[PDB]
Amino acid sequence: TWGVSSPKNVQGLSGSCLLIPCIFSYPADVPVSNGITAIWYYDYSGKRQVVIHSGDPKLVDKRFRGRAELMGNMDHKVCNLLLKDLKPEDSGTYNFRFEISDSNRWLDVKGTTVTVTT
């Protein structure tokens, strides 16, 4: 049911890409007749910058424009995030959130912490 699954920690290296495995879950009795909106946030508690937005890619922060991709299959509960050409600044917490229909939305409050090594 209601939940998101992703590693507490992830390490990567500059220049290289990185994949944060992710899978979400929700009650089967909830109607999803309009698709699901995937949204990846960076530093939710602070700046709260939008890394990914299946709904409207116009909402993506520039900091991340072009260097993030959602390699998931929404119809499979998969929300894998791929960050291209890692950088030291890209370190921080990434939180996933999906929306099925207003009253039906879910944010993962734990998130994944990315540490970009040397």
GROMACS .gro file of C-alpha atoms in nm:
model
  118
    1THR     CA    1   0.000   0.000   0.000
    2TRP     CA    2   0.099   0.364   0.056
    3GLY     CA    3   0.477   0.372   0.046
    4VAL     CA    4   0.802   0.441  -0.141
    5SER     CA    5   1.118   0.230  -0.139
    6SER     CA    6   1.466   0.368  -0.207
    7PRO     CA    7   1.814   0.334  -0.047
    8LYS     CA    8   1.898   0.558   0.247
    9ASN     CA    9   2.242   0.620   0.097
   10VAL     CA   10   2.406   0.627  -0.244
   11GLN     CA   11   2.762   0.722  -0.339
   12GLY     CA   12   2.877   0.822  -0.685
   13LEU     CA   13   3.171   0.984  -0.864
   14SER     CA   14   3.208   1.312  -1.052
   15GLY     CA   15   3.152   1.302  -1.426
   16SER     CA   16   2.984   0.963  -1.405
   17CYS     CA   17   2.608   0.898  -1.395
   18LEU     CA   18   2.419   0.746  -1.105
   19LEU     CA   19   2.103   0.539  -1.054
   20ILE     CA   20   1.890   0.563  -0.739
   21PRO     CA   21   1.676   0.248  -0.741
   22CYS     CA   22   1.316   0.332  -0.653
   23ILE     CA   23   0.981   0.153  -0.623
   24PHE     CA   24   0.653   0.285  -0.485
   25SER     CA   25   0.333   0.123  -0.366
   26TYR     CA   26  -0.031   0.220  -0.305
   27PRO     CA   27  -0.378   0.067  -0.231
   28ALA     CA   28  -0.518  -0.136  -0.523
   29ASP     CA   29  -0.866  -0.001  -0.443
   30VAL     CA   30  -0.753   0.348  -0.547
   31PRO     CA   31  -0.857   0.451  -0.899
   32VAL     CA   32  -0.567   0.550  -1.125
   33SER     CA   33  -0.773   0.630  -1.434
   34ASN     CA   34  -0.560   0.932  -1.517
   35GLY     CA   35  -0.205   0.814  -1.487
   36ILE     CA   36   0.035   0.897  -1.206
   37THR     CA   37   0.250   1.209  -1.174
   38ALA     CA   38   0.611   1.139  -1.070
   39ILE     CA   39   0.804   1.415  -0.902
   40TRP     CA   40   1.159   1.405  -0.773
   41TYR     CA   41   1.263   1.673  -0.526
   42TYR     CA   42   1.611   1.782  -0.426
   43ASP     CA   43   1.655   1.920  -0.072
   44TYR     CA   44   1.282   1.919   0.005
   45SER     CA   45   1.316   2.081   0.350
   46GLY     CA   46   1.538   2.360   0.222
   47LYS     CA   47   1.534   2.483  -0.137
   48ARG     CA   48   1.295   2.208  -0.248
   49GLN     CA   49   1.412   2.210  -0.609
   50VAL     CA   50   1.223   1.999  -0.861
   51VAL     CA   51   1.454   1.738  -1.022
   52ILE     CA   52   1.192   1.552  -1.222
   53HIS     CA   53   0.828   1.617  -1.308
   54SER     CA   54   0.647   1.376  -1.538
   55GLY     CA   55   0.347   1.608  -1.525
   56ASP     CA   56   0.512   1.924  -1.662
   57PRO     CA   57   0.888   1.917  -1.737
   58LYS     CA   58   0.865   2.294  -1.747
   59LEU     CA   59   0.872   2.284  -1.365
   60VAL     CA   60   1.220   2.131  -1.347
   61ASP     CA   61   1.483   2.349  -1.185
   62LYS     CA   62   1.753   2.464  -1.430
   63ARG     CA   63   2.017   2.328  -1.196
   64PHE     CA   64   1.885   1.989  -1.310
   65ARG     CA   65   1.750   2.058  -1.658
   66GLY     CA   66   1.886   1.797  -1.899
   67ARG     CA   67   2.093   1.608  -1.640
   68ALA     CA   68   1.822   1.397  -1.476
   69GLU     CA   69   1.601   1.125  -1.619
   70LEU     CA   70   1.327   0.903  -1.479
   71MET     CA   71   1.406   0.546  -1.581
   72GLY     CA   72   1.094   0.400  -1.432
   73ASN     CA   73   0.785   0.224  -1.562
   74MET     CA   74   0.507   0.395  -1.370
   75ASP     CA   75   0.278   0.104  -1.458
   76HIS     CA   76   0.526  -0.121  -1.276
   77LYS     CA   77   0.567   0.075  -0.952
   78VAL     CA   78   0.921   0.172  -1.062
   79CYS     CA   79   1.053   0.525  -1.002
   80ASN     CA   80   1.428   0.491  -1.069
   81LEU     CA   81   1.612   0.822  -1.095
   82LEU     CA   82   1.918   0.866  -1.313
   83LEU     CA   83   2.139   1.171  -1.257
   84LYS     CA   84   2.379   1.233  -1.542
   85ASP     CA   85   2.734   1.373  -1.502
   86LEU     CA   86   2.751   1.387  -1.123
   87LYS     CA   87   2.892   1.692  -0.943
   88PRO     CA   88   2.985   1.769  -0.581
   89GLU     CA   89   2.696   2.015  -0.549
   90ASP     CA   90   2.453   1.739  -0.649
   91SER     CA   91   2.512   1.591  -0.303
   92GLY     CA   92   2.210   1.604  -0.076
   93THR     CA   93   1.875   1.439  -0.024
   94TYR     CA   94   1.643   1.342  -0.304
   95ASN     CA   95   1.278   1.271  -0.224
   96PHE     CA   96   1.024   1.107  -0.450
   97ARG     CA   97   0.654   1.189  -0.463
   98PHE     CA   98   0.378   1.055  -0.688
   99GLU     CA   99   0.020   1.183  -0.737
  100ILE     CA  100  -0.276   0.971  -0.843
  101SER     CA  101  -0.552   1.230  -0.790
  102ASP     CA  102  -0.547   1.518  -0.540
  103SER     CA  103  -0.671   1.345  -0.226
  104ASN     CA  104  -0.441   1.066  -0.344
  105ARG     CA  105  -0.081   1.182  -0.328
  106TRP     CA  106   0.225   1.050  -0.147
  107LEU     CA  107   0.562   1.191  -0.050
  108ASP     CA  108   0.846   0.981   0.082
  109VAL     CA  109   0.972   1.170   0.387
  110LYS     CA  110   1.289   0.962   0.430
  111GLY     CA  111   1.438   0.998   0.081
  112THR     CA  112   1.782   0.904  -0.052
  113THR     CA  113   2.105   1.083   0.035
  114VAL     CA  114   2.351   1.119  -0.248
  115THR     CA  115   2.717   1.172  -0.168
  116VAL     CA  116   2.929   1.270  -0.465
  117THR     CA  117   3.282   1.145  -0.390
  118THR     CA  118   3.606   1.308  -0.515
   0.00000   0.00000   0.00000
